[PDB]
Design a protein around this ligand. Sequence first.
Ligand SMILES: O=C(O)CNC(=O)C(=O)O
Ligand SMILES: [Mg+2]
Ligand code: NI
Ligand SMILES: [Zn+2]
Length: 331
Amino acid sequence: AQNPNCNIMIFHPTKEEFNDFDKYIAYMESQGAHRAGLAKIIPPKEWKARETYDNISEILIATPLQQVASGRAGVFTQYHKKKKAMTVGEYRHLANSKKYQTPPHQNFEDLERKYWKNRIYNSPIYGADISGSLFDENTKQWNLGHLGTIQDLLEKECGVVIEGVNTPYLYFGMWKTTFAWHTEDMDLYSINYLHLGEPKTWYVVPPEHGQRLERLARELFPGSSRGCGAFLRHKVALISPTVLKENGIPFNRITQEAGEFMVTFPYGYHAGFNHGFNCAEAINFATPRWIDYGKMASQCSCGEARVTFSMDAFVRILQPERYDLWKRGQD
Ligand SMILES: O=C(O)CNC(=O)C(=O)O
Ligand SMILES: [Mg+2]
Ligand code: NI
Ligand SMILES: [Zn+2]
């Protein structure tokens, strides 16, 4: 069995290996990369996502989200308070202001310490989930707006033709902006490219141990657990590495820098934070190996998780027993 300790693997494809996306994903899995839940892919030196970022400040963040925390430093939830629209230029200036800027630090480890110590005492503003792409249309390799669609994959594997579309999303971050513990919708893969700026630290639980994290989360967030049998789908709960280690939960960590891709694998729980002003692009995708995870994915039916149009068909075809209850949650 490849990668039996479920370590995060880092890949350095050549320019030739970077041509066929699906083939490279399947290669990484042949080496056991999925067992970690997360892999890093460093593009060949000849590749670029676009020519420059000199012209992005006019993008609009229509609904910036202020991430307000409740709890204790290692075990907290966050809620998103909607703020007035601002441009990326405005948001960058805000990120760099004395109130929001990254503090002086020695290295990534010192910064990680500071994040876990102090996160809850601040409310950083995240420009998340913005439909769009920063890949040049002429970038032919690993262009996250030109991937094969999940609808087409389900059609190829299962023969059924369904409605829905699959487009990328931009994320503008600042110091302390946080992504809560989650798997993807329908336990899909994700791919995330850090276009520019400061790093992003990731934490991940191997898919084979995801239920250990869920059981801890039910213990740590007992009201939430009574409200919903899949409350991590609400994407609000944080648990620190120290707390994970105290409770024997297997996990790994890695820091993504600008110019790097990360892939999350089906049912790989992940969480993390941004080091400073940055911009990432991400999208969900599927492979044939996903289909069995899609069929078994938990679902939030309490009404909180509220998701895209395209998840309807995935539930309807892969989980017909659950469909009626899940759709009641959506409506
Ligand atoms: O970058 C972020 O804030 C969160 N991204 C992801 O969870 C992902 O790419 O799957
Ligand atoms: Mg612009
Ligand atoms: Ni994710
Ligand atoms: Zn719910």
